[PDB]
Amino acid sequence: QSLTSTLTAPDGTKVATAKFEFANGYATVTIATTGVGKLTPGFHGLHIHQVGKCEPNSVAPTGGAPGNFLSAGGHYHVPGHTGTPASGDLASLQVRGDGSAMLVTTTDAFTMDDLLSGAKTAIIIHAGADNFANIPPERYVQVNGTPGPDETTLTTGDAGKRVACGVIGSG
Amino acid sequence: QSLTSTLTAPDGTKVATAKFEFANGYATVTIATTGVGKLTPGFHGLHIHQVGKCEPNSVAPTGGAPGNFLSAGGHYHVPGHTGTPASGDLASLQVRGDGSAMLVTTTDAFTMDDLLSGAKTAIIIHAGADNFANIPPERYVQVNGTPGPDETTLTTGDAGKRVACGVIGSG
Ligand SMILES: [Cu+2]
Ligand SMILES: [Cu+2]
């Protein structure tokens, strides 16, 4: 009834582990650091991405300059589901002053079969906080003049670089 | 070693309960709904506010039109601490399709004595998602032209109205 992952940093060292427990039609997701000093204090975006690969200095499926864990692709969507929040979006990881963290959250947005389908999936911790695409259109505009969030914000939450990654399965 | 709270809706019905467990120099915060159908599906801002009052149609300490749980004041800051994230900021509450939710998160930003000091504190669930004041200044401006987040965003995360509130103590 469970999937797991061990998340590593770009240099290959272990950062955290995750459990995905499926029961009663939903997932209970637990993630916690395995030591100290490996994440910056504060809030970090946490999402499931659409390809089960955790390769430092890699290229995204549709192209771009290489970067950490980019071959994991974009946010995970259950087939036939578009828009925000993506199926793979999770509550943020709150990191204490010593770099340690623990989160439990729940979601009915995906199943075990979903995560094991196809190219599999990866859980990613971002460098920055997730804005959940909440950019008040009455008070903020894009630099082109359009009110509210742009496509990049809608699909990423502007959480920045990928600082830890684990493939979801049995690891 | 623990504080608790029972959170109610503006009509007085029970929505969720919370536990604040203090050990090893940090707080482990658990919050979960007590039934179904009482919060909207999706992500909800979750913060500790600076006054231990949960009054529907109330006025903020420094004034304004009445609104739900406004007498709880603004975000909680440990005395001598300013800026964002506020001491009272927590990971967001992720609500499933049926309105149910569970969150565990941790923080070293406050102690038991902090929460029991003075006018006490309240835990609040917001209607909207928290943006964590992440409004990319390279791509977004305030309508006055200044790049990045305004003071309101910095101090609230733009999470909107207060939909449930509990005073933190023994309740
Ligand atoms: Cu992500
Ligand atoms: Cu709040």
UniProtKB/Swiss-Prot annotation, chains A, B:
The cofactors required by this protein are: Cu cation
Q: How does it sit in the membrane?
A: Lipid-anchor
Q: What GO terms are given for molecular function?
A: copper ion binding; superoxide dismutase activity
Q: Which superkingdom?
A: Bacteria
Q: Any idea which positions bind Cu cation?
A: H47, H49, H75, H126
Q: Which terms are listed as keywords in the entry?
A: Antioxidant, Cell membrane, Copper, Disulfide bond, Lipoprotein, Membrane, Metal-binding, Oxidoreductase, Palmitate, Signal, Zinc
**Free-text remark on how the cofactor is bound:** Binds 1 copper ion per subunit.
For bias type Polar residues, the affected ranges are 1-8
Kindly state which reaction or reactions the protein catalyses: 2 superoxide + 2 H(+) = H2O2 + O2
GO CC terms, sorted: plasma membrane
- Where found? Cell membrane
What pairs make up the disulfide bonds? Answer: C54-C165
Query: E.C. number, please?
Result: 1.15.1.1
- Tell me the subunit arrangement: Homodimer.
Q: What does this protein do?
A: Destroys radicals which are normally produced within the cells and which are toxic to biological systems. May play a role in favoring mycobacterial survival in phagocytes.
What does the similarity note say? Belongs to the Cu-Zn superoxide dismutase family.
> What is the protein's name according to its record?
Superoxide dismutase [Cu-Zn]
Q: Which organism is it from?
A: Mycobacterium tuberculosis (strain CDC 1551 / Oshkosh)
The gene behind this protein is sodC
What part of the full protein is here?
Answer: 70 to 240 of 240
